[PDB]
């Protein structure tokens, strides 16, 4: 029968037929990127140059028109099938088989022929085996509709045992080499095996080459074939054709048969024999059209764009490649693209053009992104934009359903696929927690949206991304790494990328983008559009505009010059661009010229409140709305934050996430609300996983530290669970959690962001019935993103200088999630070291924009009265008379806005978990434990307990040469001082025994180790924990215990935890590291050297501050200062003097120190070494302070 040339010579040869059998089914299978599609596009070429009109059944949405062109396909005369489903696909190809004169059909690809079933939800029992049965189905029916037409059908594969037997021929293409030009990639040595042949002989294989951007090289193989078949003679290097010399090497031998057409064709043949009407279409087309919905197959080179309604993308060159001149009103559009590609700009740009034509639009936001200010420069009327911030994946998808059945919502924008994270994930509900399974949630409420949008003319847009990734792999792009469904139910599909970026000299102010239209059931698919996107300006309207008035000779390219009807307009695209900018109409007409040359509040105001009734109160609104749901508010501290919050403070009994980088301000603000609350009565709780909190700073910020509740939990879980019952009290009005990331679970004591998901939903409710406001802090797990009622974005931007001195951080808070009022509004303000949020600073600014204070360029006036010059000097004038302040304070507010349950539920928590893991911070109440003296005095006072808790864990940390070691050795000393024997695990290979002696240890009774490995050390002290009364152990230092330098720890950390509470044995770790321990301590210390003690000229000291950071023994966050004398040790008398001062026993007369009216010392210095010389009257003060703080 009839045969079509493969494009390769030897493929034809191994086929036995000199081509691929017409009227049969032919399968080409093999690893991806092996030349599958090239070989394909090659037969479409060889047949295309013989009339034989061809069909391309496309589900890959791949195909490079350009690469095709150079392979040699009459693109303008090719039929492609952009099917709606795998079924429909496997029927359109059938329908063409029947229609006589449609010659060869190509399906791309078997794998992407995803069943109508999958496109929805559901299931089978030959399943994913559902395709192998959609195959088995309309296959017989095709098998015979081909021997009818001589119609050749070619299937491309990599899943369906039916196709196997109905194929008359099968090919095993694989990339097995590569071809070089000395120093380059350019080649791909390919190997094709004939597996199935009922046309001649099977099992024969044939080899050839593929060139990047040129295709199969049969001339290449021709030479080689002429070699073995006598016709061509090889004289070593110079190749021959019987006397007539042809070239040098294989490089020129091939390069010659290119210049000589006729002589080649001759040899071609001589080898072959030595081995081996137009309305049957056009009528039968409109047929498949009417039969399956209008436009779902076509020739590619067509001026036919149906006149369905068009909305401008913002880019001319996009509208152009769309075909229709805008996006299809009443359809689904997926714009996918690599993160930070430009997608959303283009997205906001459609919102732009539609809003400028009277229409009103929807924004379904699961990203919490959207820069209002940028949108406003972009062209979007933010005030009228309908914004939705859904509680969840499905819930989001269902809010569209009903914005479709409105009709006067014109365009819906969904941000974005990947971020529409479903219920099951939000709860943590396992089995397919396996996130990327609930893509079936897409397939679900998808089907229905199709209709609801079409009979509204509501245009909907989806945004996606793609996977290559866990984090970083090197596998390959699978179209749309959201869900399988959308891939078909989209009427049009966009691939925005980024390739260039552009410059204003050396600045980077641009981004060169490329949008590919890959799925197009409006017109010409696979058309593309390059243009520019400018930071803070938008799409380069004029940019592309020029480029078009090039090709449609309206603006004349005179090399580097740009002319408009004789008169010169710009040199270099640069100025041309920006010329049109200043003569708008001349452009907007040239616009129109290329567009000629290539192309009630009745129903709304009602269907709005319809969703608020059905889907939780206020789950959508115009962004410009004044309407705040009236629920009670706690002031953030920053007026401008309150304001942009919408409600005037944080929502009561709802969850709030404040996040940001480290050192942003997130805590200052956090502490500020705890303040503002405490000064209204309402009492607060602080759950601490961070052990951060500066008491002194809080005190100066305005926090009643004494009456604040602190909880230093052992496990994240436990932490949360504490909030649980702190919610069921109604007497904790504000809980603060520092911080999400640090709430590391028991399991870890990576994956368990699940813990966050857990007791989340239960805690959500308990707060509305308590007004218990809970605030989280992040830098976390997916659940919070949603259950939060308000999400805050603090970042630090600038700095504040007093003359020339860094005394402040200029901050910016952005309300990115707001289900209490208007979202996306922002507020900027000052934070000052040691004073906090700058009330007055923003107050001035407010009164300027609310016209109470008058800006005379640089001068600041308050009605007649001139109150300052330069923001600063004015700021600090309201600080000078709070009279006028408190008046303007309010006038701006006006222009923009028992102890039964407590004193009981407290101890309940102590009983439920651990005794003493919550308390008031200003508490005498210490507990009973054996306490070793730390060596200090004020330390053992700041501990509250008398010293370190026997048989718990204690971590001391801080910078190198801080005094870490010394401190410990001072403890070992004052254990030695009462029998308690000691071992000192000296991993560091530190310690100068000599020095040690000088500090006061019994050198000979401190039996100690110099371990080789981290482990040895661990299991050494492990065995000393069990070893009865060996009474305290110091590990110096966690440092040389990088061998999972915490997975190793978390091991024996569990073990030493319960071997100590047994032996009373106490363990002190030192650090500079390795998590777990952080929690497994009952006390933590922050040492730091901050001074130095001189004796005129000698560095003989180190002034030292130790903060009690973690204290599950008594009151935490207390601090103590003292002198450490090099080669003597801590200063008994040093800190003693000081204590006796603050306890009215020794009296400070400026520089003079007094005792019973008696002069004892001038300058702390001499005062000290006085008490050294009067032990009697010293020891006597010792006690009387010990009586007053122990």
Ligand X SMILES: Nc1ncnc2c1ncn2[C@@H]1O[C@@H](COP(=O)(O)OP(=O)(O)NP(=O)(O)O)[C@@H](O)[C@H]1O
* Residues 949, 1082 contacting (CB under 8 angstroms): yes
User: Hey, what are 29's tokens?
Assistant: 């299978």
The reply on whether position 831 binds ligand X by CB under 6 A is yes
- Rounded Cα distance between 920 and 651, Å, is 25
CA angle 720, 726, 728 (to 5 degrees): 115
| 884 belongs to an annotated ligand binding site | no
- Rounded Cα distance between 826 and 643, Å, is 9
| Beta strands in 431-545, from DSSP E residues, in sequence order | 459-464, 492-496, 503-504, 507-508, 510-520, 528-534, 538-539
Among 144, 177, 213, 249, binds ligand X (CB under 6 A): 213
Nearest distance from C-beta of residue 942 to ligand X, angstroms: 17
The reply on whether position 521 binds ligand X by CB under 6 A is no
User: Hey, what are 14's tokens?
Assistant: 């191994």
Minimal CA–CA distance to 737: which of 683, 774, 682? 774
Nearest distance from C-beta of residue 573 to ligand X, angstroms: 19
| 36 belongs to an annotated ligand binding site | yes
Judged by beta carbon distances under 5 to 8 A according to partner kind, the member of Mg ion, ligand X, none in contact with residue 693 is Mg ion
Nearest distance from C-beta of residue 793 to ligand X, angstroms: 13
Decide whether 33 or 1162 has the Cβ nearer to Mg ion. Answer: 33
The reply on whether position 207 binds ligand X by CB under 6 A is no
* Residues 950, 929 contacting (CB under 8 angstroms): yes
The reply on whether position 966 binds ligand X by CB under 6 A is yes
- Rounded Cα distance between 987 and 1021, Å, is 12
Phi, psi of 312 (to 5 degrees): -60, 135
Decide whether 316 or 658 has the Cβ nearer to Mg ion. Answer: 658
Considering CB under 6 A, how many residues would be counted as binding ligand X? 58
Distance of CA 1105 to the CA centre of its chain: 40
Q: In the range 365-424, which residues lie near ligand X by CB under 6 A?
A: 369, 371, 374
CA atoms within 13 A on the CB side of 80: 28
The reply on whether position 577 binds ligand X by CB under 6 A is no
| Beta strands in 618-761, from DSSP E residues, in sequence order | 621-622, 633-634, 650-651, 655-659, 684-688, 709-711, 734-738
Judged by beta carbon distances under 5 to 8 A according to partner kind, the member of Mg ion, ligand X, none in contact with residue 339 is ligand X
Instruction: Fill in the per-residue mask, 177 to 196: x = in contact with ligand X (CB under 6 A), - = not in contact.
Output: -----------x--------
The SS3 of residue 189 is: strand
Decide whether 42 or 344 has the Cβ nearer to Mg ion. Answer: 344
| 37 belongs to an annotated ligand binding site | yes
**Binding stretches for Mg ion (CB under 5 A):** 37, 60, 62, 108, 344, 369-370, 667, 692-693, 965, 990, 1036
Q: In the range 1124-1183, which residues lie near ligand X by CB under 6 A?
A: 1126-1127
- Rounded Cα distance between 525 and 495, Å, is 12
| Beta strands in 675-772, from DSSP E residues, in sequence order | 684-688, 709-711, 734-738
Nearest distance from C-beta of residue 384 to Mg ion, angstroms: 18
H/E stretch holding 997: helix 993-999
The reply on whether position 961 binds ligand X by CB under 6 A is yes
Judged by beta carbon distances under 5 to 8 A according to partner kind, the member of Mg ion, ligand X, none in contact with residue 962 is ligand X
| 1143 belongs to an annotated ligand binding site | no
Decide whether 975 or 1167 has the Cβ nearer to ligand X. Answer: 975
Close Cβ partners of 806 (under 8 Å, ≥ 6 residues apart): 799, 800
* Residues 423, 469 contacting (CB under 8 angstroms): no
- Residue holding tokens 């004349």? 556
Judged by beta carbon distances under 5 to 8 A according to partner kind, the member of ligand X, Mg ion, none in contact with residue 212 is ligand X
| 261 belongs to an annotated ligand binding site | no
Q: In the range 457-486, which residues lie near ligand X by CB under 6 A?
A: 463
Among 664, 729, 744, 758, binds ligand X (CB under 6 A): 664
Minimal CA–CA distance to 796: which of 779, 813, 780? 813
The reply on whether position 292 binds ligand X by CB under 6 A is no
Nearest distance from C-beta of residue 729 to ligand X, angstroms: 26
- Rounded Cα distance between 1096 and 276, Å, is 107
* Residues 486, 480 contacting (CB under 8 angstroms): yes
- Rounded Cα distance between 650 and 758, Å, is 24
The reply on whether position 212 binds ligand X by CB under 6 A is yes
Which residues, listed in sequence order, are joined to residue 172 by a DSSP beta bridge? 29, 193
| 549 belongs to an annotated ligand binding site | no
Identify which range of 60-68, 818-826, 894-902, 1178-1186 contacts ligand X by CB under 6 A: 60-68
The reply on whether position 1102 binds ligand X by CB under 6 A is yes
User: Hey, what are 183's tokens?
Assistant: 């120093």
Nearest distance from C-beta of residue 667 to ligand X, angstroms: 3
- Rounded Cα distance between 35 and 30, Å, is 9
Among 368, 519, 527, 666, binds ligand X (CB under 6 A): 666
Identify which range of 4-12, 93-101, 531-539, 936-944 contacts ligand X by CB under 6 A: 531-539
Decide whether 519 or 964 has the Cβ nearer to ligand X. Answer: 964
Decide whether 64 or 120 has the Cβ nearer to ligand X. Answer: 64
C-alpha distances out from residue 1184 to 41, 60, 195, 924, Å: 98, 87, 100, 18
The reply on whether position 37 binds ligand X by CB under 6 A is yes
Q: In the range 983-1002, which residues lie near ligand X by CB under 6 A?
A: 988, 990, 992, 995
Close Cβ partners of 919 (under 8 Å, ≥ 6 residues apart): 709, 710, 925, 1115
| Beta strands in 338-401, from DSSP E residues, in sequence order | 361-365, 386-388
Other Cβ atoms less than 10 A from the Cβ of 8: the count is 26
| 662 belongs to an annotated ligand binding site | yes
- Rounded Cα distance between 323 and 685, Å, is 61
Distance of CA 934 to the CA centre of its chain: 46
* Residues 883, 889 contacting (CB under 8 angstroms): no
Among 401, 512, 556, 690, binds ligand X (CB under 6 A): 690
| 250 belongs to an annotated ligand binding site | no
The reply on whether position 508 binds ligand X by CB under 6 A is no
* Residues 746, 707 contacting (CB under 8 angstroms): no
| 229 belongs to an annotated ligand binding site | no
| 344 belongs to an annotated ligand binding site | yes
The per-residue DSSP string of 748-796 comes to T-----HHHHHTHHHHHHHHHTTT-EEEEEE---TTHHHHEEEEEEEEE
Among 125, 478, 960, 978, binds ligand X (CB under 6 A): 960
- Rounded Cα distance between 26 and 156, Å, is 9
Identify which range of 288-296, 351-359, 689-697, 1073-1081 contacts ligand X by CB under 6 A: 689-697
| 963 belongs to an annotated ligand binding site | yes
The reply on whether position 965 binds ligand X by CB under 6 A is yes
CA atoms within 13 A on the CB side of 576: 23
Identify which range of 31-39, 120-128, 318-326, 754-762 contacts ligand X by CB under 6 A: 31-39
| 340 belongs to an annotated ligand binding site | yes
Nearest distance from C-beta of residue 71 to ligand X, angstroms: 9
Minimal CA–CA distance to 30: which of 188, 220, 147? 188
Decide whether 199 or 701 has the Cβ nearer to Mg ion. Answer: 701
Nearest distance from C-beta of residue 1186 to ligand X, angstroms: 27
- Rounded Cα distance between 253 and 509, Å, is 51
Identify which range of 136-144, 207-215, 241-249, 518-526 contacts ligand X by CB under 6 A: 207-215
User: Hey, what are 850's tokens?
Assistant: 């609310």
Nearest distance from C-beta of residue 1070 to Mg ion, angstroms: 7
Decide whether 249 or 959 has the Cβ nearer to ligand X. Answer: 959
The reply on whether position 67 binds ligand X by CB under 6 A is yes
Nearest distance from C-beta of residue 1001 to ligand X, angstroms: 13
Residues that bind ligand X (CB under 6 A): 32-38, 62, 64, 67, 188, 210, 212-213, 339-345, 369, 371, 374, 463, 511, 533, 535-536, 662-668, 690, 692, 694, 697, 809, 831, 833-834, 960-966, 988, 990, 992, 995, 1102, 1126-1127
Residues annotated within the binding site for ATP are 30-37, 337-344, 660-667, 958-965
Known binding positions: 30-37, 337-344, 660-667, 958-965
């Amino acid at each position: 029968v009839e045969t079509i040339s493969t494009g390769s010579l030897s493929l034809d040869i191994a086929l036995g037929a000199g081509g691929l059998p017409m009227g049969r089914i032919v399968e080409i299978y093999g690893p991806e990127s092996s030349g599958k599609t090239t070989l394909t596009l090659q037969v479409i070429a060889a047949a295309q140059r013989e009339g034989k009109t061809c069909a391309f059944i496309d589900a890959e949405h791949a195909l490079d028109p350009i690469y095709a062109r150079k392979l040699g396909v009459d693109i303008d005369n090719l039929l492609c099938s952009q099917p709606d489903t795998g079924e429909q696909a496997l029927e359109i190809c059938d329908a063409l088989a029947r229609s006589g004169a449609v010659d060869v059909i190509v399906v791309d690809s078997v794998a992407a022929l995803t069943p109508k079933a999958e496109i929805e939800g559901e299931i089978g029992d030959s399943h994913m085996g559902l395709a192998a049965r959609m195959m088995s189905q309309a296959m017989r029916k095709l098998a015979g509709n081909l021997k009818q037409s001589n119609t050749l059908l070619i299937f491309i594969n990599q899943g369906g045992n039916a196709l196997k037997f109905y194929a008359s021929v099968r090919l095993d293409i694989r990339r097995i080499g590569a071809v070089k030009e000395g120093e380059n990639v350019v080649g791909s040595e390919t190997r094709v095996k004939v597996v199935k042949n009922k046309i001649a002989a099977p099992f024969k294989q044939a080899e050839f080459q593929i060139l990047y951007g040129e295709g199969i090289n049969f001339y290449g193989e021709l030479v080689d074939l002429g070699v073995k078949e006598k016709l061509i003679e090889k004289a070593g290097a110079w190749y021959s054709y019987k006397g007539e010399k042809i070239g040098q090497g294989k490089a020129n031998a091939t390069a010659w048969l290119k210049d000589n057409p006729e002589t080649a064709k001759e040899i071609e043949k001589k080898v072959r024999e030595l081995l081996l009407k137009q309305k049957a279409l056009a009528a039968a087309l409109g047929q498949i059209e009417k039969q399956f919905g209008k436009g779902s197959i076509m020739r590619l080179g067509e001026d036919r764009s149906m006149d369905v309604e068009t909305i401008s993308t913002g880019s001319l060159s996009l509208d152009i490649a769309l075909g229709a001149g805008g996006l299809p009103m009443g359809r689904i559009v997926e714009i996918y693209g690599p993160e930070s590609s430009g997608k959303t700009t283009l997205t906001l740009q459609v919102i732009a053009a539609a809003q400028r034509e009277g229409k009103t639009c929807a924004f379904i936001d699961a990203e919490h992104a959207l820069d209002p200010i940028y949108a406003r420069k972009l062209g979007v009327d933010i005030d009228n934009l309908l914004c939705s911030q859904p509680d969840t994946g499905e819930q989001a998808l269902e809010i569209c359903d009903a914005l479709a059945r409105s009709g006067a919502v014109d365009v819906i924008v969904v941000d974005s696929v990947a971020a529409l994270t479903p219920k099951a994930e939000i709860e943590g509900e396992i089995g397919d927690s396996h996130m990327g399974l609930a893509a079936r949630m897409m397939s679900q409420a998808m089907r229905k949206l199709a209709g609801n949008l079409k009979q509204s003319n509501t245009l909907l847009i989806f945004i996606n991304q793609i996977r290559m990734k866990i984090g970083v792999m090197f596998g390959n792009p699978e179209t749309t790494t959201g869900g399988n469904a959308l891939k078909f139910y989209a009427s049009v599909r966009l691939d925005i990328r980024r390739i260039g970026a552009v410059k204003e000299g050396e600045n980077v102010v641009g981004s060169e983008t490329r949008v590919k239209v890959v799925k197009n059931k409006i017109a010409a698919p696979f058309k593309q559009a390059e243009f520019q996107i400018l930071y803070g300006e938008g799409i380069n309207f004029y940019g592309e505009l020029v480029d078009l008035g090039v090709k449609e000779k309206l603006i004349e390219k005179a090399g580097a010059w740009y002319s408009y009807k004789g008169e010169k307009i710009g040199q270099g695209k640069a100025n041309a661009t920006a010329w049109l900018k200043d003569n708008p109409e001349t452009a907007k007409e040239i616009e129109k010229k290329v567009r000629e040359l290539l192309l009630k509040q009745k129903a709304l105001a009602a269907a709005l409140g319809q969703i608020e009734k059905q889907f939780g109160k206020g789950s959508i609104m115009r962004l410009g709305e004044d309407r705040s749901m009236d629920v009670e508010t706690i002031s953030t501290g920053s007026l401008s934050l309150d304001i942009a919050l919408g409600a005037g403070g944080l929502p009561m009994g709802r969850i709030v996430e404040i996040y940001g980088p480290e050192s942003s301000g997130k805590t200052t603000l956090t502490l500020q609300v705890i303040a503002a609350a405490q000064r209204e009565g309402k009492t607060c709780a602080f759950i601490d996983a961070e052990h951060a909190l500066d008491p002194i700073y809080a005190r100066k910020l305005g926090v009643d530290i004494d009456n604040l509740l602190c909880s230093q939990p052992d496990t994240g879980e436990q932490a949360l669970e504490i909030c649980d019952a702190l919610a069921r009290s109604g007497a904790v009005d504000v809980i603060v959690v520092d911080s999400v990331a640090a709430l590391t679970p028991k399991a870890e004591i990576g994956l368990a962001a699940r813990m966050m998901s857990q007791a989340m939903r239960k805690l959500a409710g308990n707060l509305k019935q308590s007004n218990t406001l809970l605030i989280f802090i992040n830098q976390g797990g997916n659940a919070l993103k949603f259950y939060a009622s308000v999400r805050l974005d603090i970042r630090r931007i600038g700095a504040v200088k007093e003359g020339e001195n860094v005394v402040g951080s200029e901050t910016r808070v952005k309300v990115v999630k707001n289900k209490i009022a208007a979202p996306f509004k922002q507020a900027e303000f000052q934070i000052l070291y040691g004073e906090g949020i700058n009330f007055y600073g923003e107050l001035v600014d407010l009164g300027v924009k609310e016209k109470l204070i008058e800006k005379a360029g640089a001068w600041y006036s308050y009605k007649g009265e001139k109150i300052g010059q330069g923001k600063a000097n004015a700021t600090a004038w309201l600080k000078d008379n709070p009279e006028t302040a408190k008046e303007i304070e309010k006038k701006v507010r006006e222009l923009l806005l028992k102890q039964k349950a407590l004193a009981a539920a407290l101890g309940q928590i102590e009983k439920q978990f651990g005794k003493g893991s919550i308390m008031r911070l200003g508490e005498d109440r210490s507990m009973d434990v054996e306490t070793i003296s730390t060596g200090s005095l004020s330390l053992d006072i700041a501990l509250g307990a008398g010293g370190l808790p026997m048989g718990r864990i204690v971590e001391i940390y801080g910078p190198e040469s801080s005094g870490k070691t010394t401190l410990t050795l001072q403890v070992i000393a004052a254990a030695q001082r009462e029998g308690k024997t000691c071992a000192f695990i000296d991993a560091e290979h530190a310690l100068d025994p000599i020095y040690a002696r000088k500090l006061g240890v019994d050198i000979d009774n401190l039996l100690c180790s110099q371990p080789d490995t981290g482990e040895q050390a661990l299991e050494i002290c492990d065995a000393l924990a069990r070893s009865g009364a060996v009474d305290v152990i110091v590990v110096d230092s966690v440092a040389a215990l990088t061998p999972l330098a915490a997975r190793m720890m978390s091991q024996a950390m569990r073990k030493l935890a319960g071997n100590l509470k047994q032996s009373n044995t106490l363990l002190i770790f030192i650090n500079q590291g390795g998590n777990a321990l952080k929690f497994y301590a009952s006390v933590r210390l922050d040492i730091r050297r901050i001074g130095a003690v001189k004796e005129g000229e000698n560095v003989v000291g180190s002034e030292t501050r130790v903060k009690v950071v973690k204290n599950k023994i008594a009151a935490p966050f207390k601090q103590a200062e003292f002198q450490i004398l090099y080669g003597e040790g801590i200063n008994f008398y040093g800190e003693l003097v000081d204590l006796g001062v603050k306890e009215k026993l020794i009296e400070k007369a400026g520089a003079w120190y007094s005792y019973k009216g008696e002069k004892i010392g001038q300058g702390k210095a001499n005062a000290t070494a006085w008490l050294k010389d009067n032990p009697e009257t010293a020891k006597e003060i010792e006690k009387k302070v010990r009586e007053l703080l122990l």
